[PDB]
Amino acid sequence: MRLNTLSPAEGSKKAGKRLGRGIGSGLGKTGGRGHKGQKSRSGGGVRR
RNA sequence: GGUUCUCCCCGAAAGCUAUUUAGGUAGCGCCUCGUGAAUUCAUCUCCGGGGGUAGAGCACUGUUUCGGCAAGGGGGUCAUC
Numbered sequence: 001m002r003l004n005t006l007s008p009a010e011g012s013k014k015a016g017k018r019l020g021r022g023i024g025s026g027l028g029k030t031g032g033r034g035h036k037g038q039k040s041r042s043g044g045g046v047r048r
Numbered sequence: 049g050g051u052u053c054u055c056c057c058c059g060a061a062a063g064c065u066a067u068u069u070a071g072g073u074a075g076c077g078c079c080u081c082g083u084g085a086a087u088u089c090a091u092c093u094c095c096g097g098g099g100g101u102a103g104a105g106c107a108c109u110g111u112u113u114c115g116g117c118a119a120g121g122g123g124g125u126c127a128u129c
């Protein structure tokens with residue numbers, strides 16, 4: 001064991017979602033929000 | 049209005065209900081991922097059902113033409129208590 005020979009367990013290091021970074025990533029442009037609503041706006045949504 | 053690298057798998061809706069609601073939103077229908085479960089599901093053959101649409105008809109509710117019979121009407125001549 002050395003400082004450059006340790007690795008984590010498989011399945012514990014899921015990567016986060018990054019929106020709006022091109023066509024190929026699957027989340028570009030609208031970034032998962034759809035088209036033209038109150039829910040698509042910055043800060044938008046209704047109270048509980 | 050705009051939203052920046054790549055490949056693989058699956059894949060919609062533009063409907064119902066409510067709303068100072070109608071180009072917004074919420075529950076349900078429709079997509080995706082995970083888990084569990086029954087011959088659970090679809091096509092065809094045979095069997096058991098209810099029906100009142102298409103068509104037709106004129107006993108009923110309405111409407112329509114011709115012939116017969118004729119109550120009952122309208123117009124009169126004569127008589128008039």
Ligand SMILES: [Mg+2]
Binds near residue numbers: 026
């Ligand atoms: Mg996409």
Ligand SMILES: [Mg+2]
Binds near residue numbers: 032033
């Ligand atoms: Mg989303």
Ligand SMILES: [Mg+2]
């Ligand atoms: Mg836009």
Ligand SMILES: [Mg+2]
Binds near residue numbers: 036
């Ligand atoms: Mg729209």
Ligand SMILES: [Mg+2]
Binds near residue numbers: 035036038
């Ligand atoms: Mg909208």
Ligand SMILES: [Mg+2]
Binds near residue numbers: 034039
């Ligand atoms: Mg929306």
Ligand SMILES: [Mg+2]
Binds near residue numbers: 033036040
């Ligand atoms: Mg947007």
Ligand SMILES: [Mg+2]
Binds near residue numbers: 041042
């Ligand atoms: Mg905004």
Ligand SMILES: [Mg+2]
Binds near residue numbers: 042043
């Ligand atoms: Mg703001």
Ligand SMILES: [Mg+2]
Binds near residue numbers: 050
């Ligand atoms: Mg744009």
Ligand SMILES: [Mg+2]
């Ligand atoms: Mg496909």
Ligand SMILES: [Mg+2]
Binds near residue numbers: 061
């Ligand atoms: Mg459609």
Ligand SMILES: [Mg+2]
Binds near residue numbers: 036037071
């Ligand atoms: Mg709009």
Ligand SMILES: [Mg+2]
Binds near residue numbers: 072
């Ligand atoms: Mg609005």
Ligand SMILES: [Mg+2]
Binds near residue numbers: 060078079
């Ligand atoms: Mg869907």
Ligand SMILES: [Mg+2]
């Ligand atoms: Mg499934």
